[PDB]
């Protein structure tokens, strides 16, 4: 189907500064933070709006850190308890009204095997939209 | 890429 117009082409999410007596137990994670895409004027026919993720990955299968901290990885979910690692796709529906389309995400930092290390937390996700 | 999110954070001692 027709292309929406991308309203959003980055955006950031800042987990801000955590604290690794908190990130100690394996499993352990920050708290979530929002984070959300846009996309506008979705034409006539074009319903249905498909967002395919991408991004390193690490051997635990979340997003790898890019930056110094250790045994620290990322995870991204949708609002209803899905996780978007590398390859994950989401589907939203068009608002017929506005013909308009948008996507409530979260991520938040994950310790799979515990004992985070200090250092930065850095990644990107990538996001190609396909139309239906 | 049509969208790119960045995630930024620190882990302090
Ligand atoms: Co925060
Ligand atoms: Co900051
Ligand atoms: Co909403």
Same mark, same amino acid.
């Given at each position: 189907? =027709? %292309?929406?117009? $991308? &309203?959003? /082409? *980055?955006?950031?999410?800042? @987990?801000?500064?955590?604290? &690794?007596? &908190? @990130?100690?137990?394996?499993?352990?994670?920050?708290?979530?933070?929002? #984070?959300?895409?846009?996309? /506008?004027?979705? %034409? #006539?026919?074009?319903?249905? $709006?498909?967002?395919?993720? +991408?991004?390193?990955?690490?051997?635990?299968?979340?997003? =790898? *850190?890019?930056?110094?901290?250790? *045994?620290?990885?990322?995870? @991204?979910?949708?609002? +209803?308890?899905?996780? @978007?690692?590398?390859?994950?796709? =989401?589907?939203?529906? $068009?608002?017929? +009204?506005?013909?308009?389309?948008?996507? %409530?995400?979260? #991520?938040?930092?994950?310790?799979?095997?515990?004992?985070?290390?200090?250092? /930065?937390?850095?990644? $990107?996700?990538?996001?190609?939209?396909?139309?239906? | 890429?049509?969208?790119?999110? !960045?995630? !930024?954070?620190?882990? !302090?001692?």
């Amino acid at each position: 189907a =027709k %292309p929406c117009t $991308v &309203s959003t /082409t *980055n955006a950031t999410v800042d @987990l801000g500064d955590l604290y &690794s007596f &908190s @990130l100690m137990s394996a499993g352990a994670a920050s708290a979530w933070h929002d #984070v959300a895409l846009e996309l /506008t004027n979705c %034409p #006539v026919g074009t319903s249905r $709006v498909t967002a395919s993720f +991408s991004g390193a990955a690490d051997s635990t299968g979340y997003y =790898k *850190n890019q930056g110094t901290a250790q *045994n620290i990885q990322l995870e @991204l979910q949708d609002d +209803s308890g899905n996780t @978007l690692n590398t390859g994950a796709t =989401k589907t939203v529906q $068009v608002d017929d +009204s506005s013909q308009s389309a948008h996507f %409530p995400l979260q #991520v938040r930092a994950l310790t799979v095997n515990g004992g985070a290390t200090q250092g /930065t937390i850095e990644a $990107v996700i990538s996001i190609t939209y396909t139309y239906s | 890429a049509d969208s790119r999110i !960045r995630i !930024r954070g620190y882990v !302090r001692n």
